[PDB]
Design a protein around this ligand. Structure first.
Ligand SMILES: O=C(NC[C@@H]1CCCC[C@H]1CCOc1cccnc1)c1cccc(OC(F)(F)F)c1
Ligand SMILES: [Cl-]
Length: 284
C-alpha cells in the first residue's frame, strides 16, 4: 500500500464516471511520475462501490502490454489507484498526430512501426484470453502509449466527451460501442473472447488508418446496427471496413477473418500476434 501524503499532485489528466485521474510525483518510492485515480468531489455511495471493483478487476492483470496497478492507498486514506504514467496519452490521439512516412522523400511513423504497435495489442489480448478475461470495449481510444512506442491496453470507460460519437445510447440500456462490435453482440448483447477478436480487427483497421477516420464513418448508427442483421440472415448483403491505404492485401485478408460470421472461424490472438510479428514482415 501507499500513503496519500507521499504523493505530489501536479496536473489533471482526465475525468471518469466514478473517479478522476492526476499526474503525480513520488519523491520516496519503494522524480518518479505516476498516474493516480481518486474519487470525484461529489463522490457517491455507488461511485465508491464501482471504484473498489475497478481495483479488484485491475489487480488480476499482469502483463507487459496491459495497464498495471502499481499500488493503492492505505485504507483510512481517501481511496486511490496508482499506475504508470504513460506520457504519450491514448493511442488514437497519438496516431492522429503522425502520418505514414514517405520512403521516397511533423513526426512520422513507418509501416513496420505500425506492425509493432498492432503486435503489442495482440500480445496483450493474448494474455487476457489466457485468463478468460473479456475486455468488451477494445479500440485505439482505450490503448495508452509510453516511451519508444510501447503500448498498453486499458479501459477508460465510456464517458469521455471526446469519444461520445463512438457509443450508441438508448435510455435505460447499456451503452454500446457498436462500430467495434461483432454482429452477435449487437443482436444479442453478449460478449466473448471471439467478439474481442472482432473488435481487434477494427482496432487494427484504426491503426492502419492512423486513426484518421471512424469505422463505417459515412453510415449512420442505425445502418451499422442493421448491418449486424445482414450478418445474421447471411445472404451476402453484409458490408465490411475497406482496405486502408497503408495496409497490404495479405494483412487485410487477416483483418477480414476477424469479421467471420462464425465465431469459431475468427483467428485466435496467438495467430494474430504471430502474423503481425513475423508473417507481415515479408509484405514490407
Ligand atoms: O484502464 C483501466 N482503468 C483506468 C485507469 C485506472 C487507474 C488510473 C489510470 C486509468 C487510465 C488512464 O491512465 C493514464 C492516462 C494518461 C496517462 N498515463 C496513464 C482499466 C479498468 C478496468 C479493467 C481494465 O483492464 C483492461 F484494460 F484490460 F480492460 C483496465
Ligand atoms: Cl478514469
Amino acid at each position: 500500500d501507499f500513503p496519500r501524503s507521499r504523493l505530489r499532485f501536479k496536473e489533471k489528466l482526465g475525468e471518469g464516471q466514478f473517479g478522476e485521474v492526476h499526474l503525480c510525483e513520488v519523491d520516496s518510492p519503494q522524480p518518479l511520475l505516476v498516474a493516480v485515480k481518486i474519487l470525484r468531489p461529489d463522490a457517491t455511495k455507488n461511485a465508491r462501490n464501482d471504484f473498489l471493483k475497478e481495483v479488484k478487476i485491475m489487480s488480476r492483470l499482469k502483463d507487459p502490454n496491459i495497464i498495471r496497478l502499481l499500488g493503492v492507498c492505505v485504507q483510512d486514506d481517501p481511496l486511490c489507484m496508482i499506475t504508470d504514467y504513460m506520457e504519450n496519452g491514448d493511442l488514437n490521439q497519438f496516431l492522429s498526430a503522425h502520418q505514414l512516412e514517405d520512403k521516397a522523400a511533423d513526426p512520422t511513423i513507418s509501416y513496420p512501426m505500425l506492425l509493432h504497435v498492432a503486435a503489442q495489442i495482440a500480445s496483450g489480448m493474448r494474455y487476457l484470453a489466457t485468463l478468460n478475461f473479456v475486455h468488451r470495449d477494445l479500440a485505439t481510444r482505450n490503448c495508452l502509449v509510453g516511451e519508444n512506442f510501447t503500448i498498453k491496453i486499458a479501459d477508460f470507460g465510456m464517458s469521455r466527451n471526446l469519444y461520445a460519437g463512438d457509443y450508441y445510447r438508448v435510455q435505460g440500456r447499456a451503452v454500446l460501442p457498436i462500430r467495434w462490435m461483432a454482429w452477435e453482440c449487437i443482436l444479442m448483447g453478449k460478449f466473448t473472447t471471439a467478439s474481442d477478436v472482432w473488435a481487434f480487427g477494427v482496432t487494427l483497421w484504426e491503426v492502419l488508418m492512423l486513426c484518421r477516420a471512424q469505422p463505417f464513418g459515412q453510415l449512420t448508427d442505425e445502418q451499422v446496427i442493421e448491418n449486424a442483421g445482414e450478418f445474421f440472415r447471411d445472404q451476402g448483403r453484409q458490408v465490411y471496413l475497406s482496405r486502408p491505404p497503408a495496409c497490404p492485401q495479405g494483412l487485410y485478408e487477416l483483418m477480414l477473418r476477424c469479421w467471420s460470421r462464425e465465431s469459431e472461424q475468427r483467428p485466435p490472438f496467438s495467430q494474430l500476434h504471430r502474423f503481425l510479428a513475423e508473417d507481415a514482415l515479408n509484405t514490407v
